[PDB]
Design a protein around this ligand. Structure first.
Ligand SMILES: NC(=O)c1ccc[n+]([C@@H]2O[C@H](COP(=O)([O-])OP(=O)(O)OC[C@H]3O[C@@H](n4cnc5c(N)ncnc54)[C@H](OP(=O)(O)O)[C@@H]3O)[C@@H](O)[C@H]2O)c1
Ligand SMILES: O=C(O)COc1cc(F)ccc1C(=O)NCc1cccc([N+](=O)[O-])c1
Length: 313
């Protein structure tokens, strides 16, 4: 298992990265420092996570310390929904760059296909509680992303939470200049994504799996929800291989040619989660894990279901 995957922009992307959604601002600097110290070279970020400044402190310190060189890091961020208009994309990218202490991003994603009304609120609401859409579509937002490549702000551009038809819309865009390098989607044994993964891979788009552990710290968790880390069937595979359940859950997407971005702020788990390059799941293990699919989503976007571009109908 090589550590990097070749993207369709000619650059290589580390297949294991550190997630940062929900990482508290007072803990994420040390989390990223530890991650870099123990071998991580890819950090997944977003403006909406409200902690990019603190992620950036860690990156800058490790560059200053010469623990790593900038060209060895692969830093990803995402354009939030309230910045889909053409005139807002560059400034949104530049705010993320400033916060992360970077001159360029390795990859910048459209975070969700849904555009929302610009303003201070990340979820602008009407008086009845619906999110207020923007009238800017995915194709014009994509053209604005292409400009960022042509200005040197980002090395690669991609998409996130785009369904099959939305990916195809991008690929079929009149005058398309750069194909998306990545589609970052939720993926784990309860949401195995065979159809969307095969489509993206067949077009040369690399898939990144988010919430690979089932996001046990998601803010909307309910007790009746299934739990990957506690599933006896997955624990049994881990025991057979003398690895933790989390390690199995991270290795699983790796063997599907996916990138995977487990989140932790716990030093011992950050290190544990990286120790996944030294064992192999069998084909039978892989098919068994795939069999657990139930189309269960951490990020279901249930408050966004009437948006013309809601992705999960
Ligand atoms: N593009 C998108 O729309 C989108 C959506 C969701 C997520 N993402 C990205 O994907 C990343 C990962 O997804 P996620 O944050 O939803 O959840 P996740 O990575 O599936 O799970 C994170 C949770 O698992 C715990 N954990 C981590 N390693 C563990 C281990 N070895 N043993 C036991 N528990 C462990 C963490 O606890 P501690 O931190 O307390 O250790 C945290 O509670 C995000 O942080 C974000 O970067 C992107
Ligand atoms: O979107 C992520 O990366 C994780 O989830 C969130 C993180 C945040 F910091 C804030 C909000 C979310 C969240 O609600 N994310 C879910 C979401 C967002 C936008 C649109 C949709 N949609 O289905 O169209 C869904």
């Amino acid at each position: 298992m090589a550590s990097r995957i070749l993207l369709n922009n000619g650059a290589k992307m580390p297949i294991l990265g550190l997630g940062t959604w929900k990482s508290p601002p007072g803990q994420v600097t040390e989390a990223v420092k530890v991650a870099i110290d123990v071998g991580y070279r890819h950090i997944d970020c977003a403006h909406v996570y409200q902690n990019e400044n603190e992620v950036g402190v860690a990156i800058q310190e490790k560059l200053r310390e010469q623990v790593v060189k900038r060209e060895e890091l692969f830093i990803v961020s995402k354009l939030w929904c309230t910045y889909h208009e053409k005139g807002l994309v560059k400034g949104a990218c530049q705010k993320t760059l400033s916060d992360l202490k970077l001159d360029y991003l390795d990859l910048y994603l459209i975070h969700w296909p849904t555009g929302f009304k610009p303003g201070k609120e990340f979820f602008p609401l009407d008086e009845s509680g619906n999110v207020v859409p923007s009238d800017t579509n995915i194709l014009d937002t994509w053209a604005a992303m292409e400009e960022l490549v042509d200005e040197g702000l980002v090395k690669a551009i991609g998409i996130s939470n785009f369904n099959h038809l939305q990916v195809e819309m991008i690929l079929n865009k009149p005058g398309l200049k750069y194909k998306p390098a990545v589609n970052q989607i939720e993926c784990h044994p309860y949401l195995t994504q065979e159809k969307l993964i095969q489509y993206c891979q067949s077009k040369g788009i690399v898939v990144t799996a988010y919430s690979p552990l089932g996001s046990p710290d998601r803010p909307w968790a309910k007790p009746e929800d299934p739990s990957l880390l506690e599933d006896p069937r997955i624990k049994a595979i881990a025991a057979k291989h003398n690895k933790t359940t989390a390690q199995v859950l991270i290795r699983f997407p790796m063997q599907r040619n996916l990138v995977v971005i487990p989140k932790s702020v716990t030093p011992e788990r950050i290190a544990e989660n990286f120790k996944v390059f030294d064992f192999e799941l069998s084909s039978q293990d892989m098919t068994t894990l795939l069999s657990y699919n139930r189309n269960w989503r951490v990020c279901g976007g249930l408050s966004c279901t009437s948006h013309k571009d809601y992705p999960f109908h």
